[PDB]
Write a protein that binds this ligand. Structure first.
Ligand code: K
Ligand code: K
Ligand code: K
Ligand code: MG
Ligand code: MG
Ligand code: MG
Ligand code: MG
Lengths: 377, 377
């Protein structure tokens, strides 16, 4: 019935997200020269320094120092007084390089085991959960307005957290909203508070959802002048939830950034979002979670399961049927189905991996074809 | 109805878990001298090296080099030929120290926002999900037998993944089992395969669950001689799922290790396991997930929600009622309720944080008292 759920998001320039973006920015850069490169690049960011370390198996030659500094500069950490300067921080690499030396490629077995969970739900335009959609849209507004000179006393680092009240299955409205933005010395908190309200919160959160009763908490501790990796620590794979579905859906361990698409931890997860978005887009269910798992060197998935949580329009038996017809969940099948061997990966690393319609895993192309085999309707 | 679920676990000495254990081992050591120390210590492990970096606010003086090497030695990476030697690897710190300089302590607001999810379910003895319980028990056996001279050709690093088949809500049995163990040069795979079967798998997995149809995959790629941080990368907070509930339950972003109990990301999560285990232990439901959230500098939780997923014995209204009576979910309340300011944290860092009955969050003490207010029965 009535009950509430929460999801947080952070911006580009929160320290773990800096790490994600740099990892994915090396990955993109390597993919650009060598689309079949196998890469796993993990990054750690602390007040002075960025350490980017990984194994890469490629022919590409890339400049990790340069890639690091340019990513840190778009985010905007450009002066010691913000916390971190892209132009003078230390960059260290410990990247170990290797150079590359079944009859049907598609049958090649999964490298590493694991479980990936994908979800979709009709509660938004983008078939995503409303919480995490709004949480991202907030932090995203924050960067936009920061970067576009509107509220140029903002600094990079920022968190949002929306909490939504649902009477059963229907988003009723927004109980609380939290928003905290790093900002300059020369603005004080009450003046900040109407700017964040007017220019960030008011244009994103939908007004009939928003009420007398909505508890807003903009910079609740006040001040927050120095952020980013000053006094804190970013490392890749730490904002796993924000990255996916804000905790609306489950998650098996795994991080995405710095992982080239052969890594099932990333590409099975993308593929799984893709089957669930297609299932719901065709009205086979209202909301659908899928778990695929893999075992090392088997190529067919060791498990599939769907939970259309009471929301079917065709029984789950038949659904599990069609999941295997329309979708090649084999490790090399996913790459194929979704055309993954491209430098599309950096834009993924902030603002969430799913729910953005221009990613190959978000396209609803198998929609009707899936309805058909499920009994055209 | 019939459908299947999977969960993985890894051992001590899988590289991210090495990182967790070292983080928590510094934490324990600081807590031992200064129980009120605020600590956040993140660790990164790569072939040569361990980098332990964090902020700590304490009076304690501890030896990070020494703590690092002793943890790496119990795990057992002791010679270059395994991949990593505790006695010669590089240890670097970038720990930034500070020295400590509302009227009711319990009312002090949460430092940092977030969402924590706790779960319990009656499907095991320990009120945990059967998958993750069995997955851990496998990797745990592996270390036991390794360490106790039974199968001393084993090496530290190892993954398990059990996949369970459930007809509705009842574990029916085990479809697949995967187990991969680092091992010495002087044992080959078929001989390894009956040892892993007899001495590891056969004494852990329950036999009526185990069948003709169970697909076992012991070292499926074969060989696996060198592991640990050789050629790979561990960092804290990467085995978040294994750490909790194997993906049976949801998770809001956050890691535990290296975080002193003031960190809600850790202690709210422990507290949440604790409310759900108590609820189910009292038979208010068969299985219960709780989300608490917090906003920065508020002290009452911004949300609670329970999902007894159709399994109640008292309506969820009244359940949400009692959650707030028996449990002080305020940041300083949790510490209190669960007596957290102690060096109990290292044993947490491998084999899973919940489901082990001797942790203060696993004790079922509020059991009957909770049944009572819910209508004694
Ligand atoms: K993580
Ligand atoms: K990674
Ligand atoms: K941590
Ligand atoms: Mg953090
Ligand atoms: Mg993995
Ligand atoms: Mg890993
Ligand atoms: Mg947090």
């Amino acid at each position: 019935a009535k009950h509430l759920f929460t999801s947080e998001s952070v911006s580009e320039g929160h320290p773990d997200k800096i790490a994600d973006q740099i990892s994915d920015a090396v990955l993109d850069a390597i993919l650009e020269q060598d689309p079949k490169a196998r890469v796993a690049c993990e990054t750690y960011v602390k007040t002075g320094m960025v350490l980017v370390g990984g194994e890469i198996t490629t022919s590409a030659w890339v400049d990790i120092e340069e890639i690091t500094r340019n990513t840190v500069r778009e985010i905007g950490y450009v002066h010691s007084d913000m916390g971190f300067d892209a132009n003078s921080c230390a960059v260290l690499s410990a990247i170990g390089k290797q150079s590359p030396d079944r009859a049907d490629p598609l049958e090649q077995g999964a490298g590493d085991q694991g479980l990936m969970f994908g979800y979709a739900t009709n509660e938004t335009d983008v078939l995503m959960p409303a919480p995490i959609t709004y949480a991202h849209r907030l932090v995203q507004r924050q960067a936009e307005v920061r970067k576009n000179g509107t509220l140029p006393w903002l600094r990079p680092d920022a968190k949002s957290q929306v909490t939504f009240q649902y009477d059963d299955g229907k988003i009723v409205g927004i109980d609380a909203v939290v928003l905290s933005t790093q900002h300059s010395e020369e603005i004080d908190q009450k003046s900040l508070q109407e700017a964040v309200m007017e220019e960030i919160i008011k244009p994103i959160l939908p007004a009939e959802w928003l009420t007398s009763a909505t508890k807003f908490f903009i910079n609740p501790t006040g001040r927050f002048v120095i952020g980013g990796p000053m006094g804190d620590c970013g490392l890749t794979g730490r904002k796993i939830i924000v990255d996916t579905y804000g905790g609306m859906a489950r998650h098996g361990g795994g991080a995405f950034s710095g992982k080239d698409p052969s890594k099932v931890d990333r590409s099975a997860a993308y593929a799984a979002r893709y089957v669930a978005k297609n299932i719901v887009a065709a009205g086979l269910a209202d909301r659908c979670e899928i778990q695929v798992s893999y075992a090392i060197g088997v190529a067919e998935p060791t498990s599939i399961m769907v939970e259309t949580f009471g929301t079917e329009k065709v029984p789950s038996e038949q659904l599990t049927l069609l999941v295997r017809e329309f979708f090649d969940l084999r490790p090399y099948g996913l790459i194929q189905m979704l055309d993954l061997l491209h430098p599309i990966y950096k834009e993924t690393a902030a603002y969430g991996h799913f729910g953005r319609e221009h990613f190959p895993w978000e396209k609803t192309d198998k929609a009707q074809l899936l309805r058909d085999a499920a009994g055209l309707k």
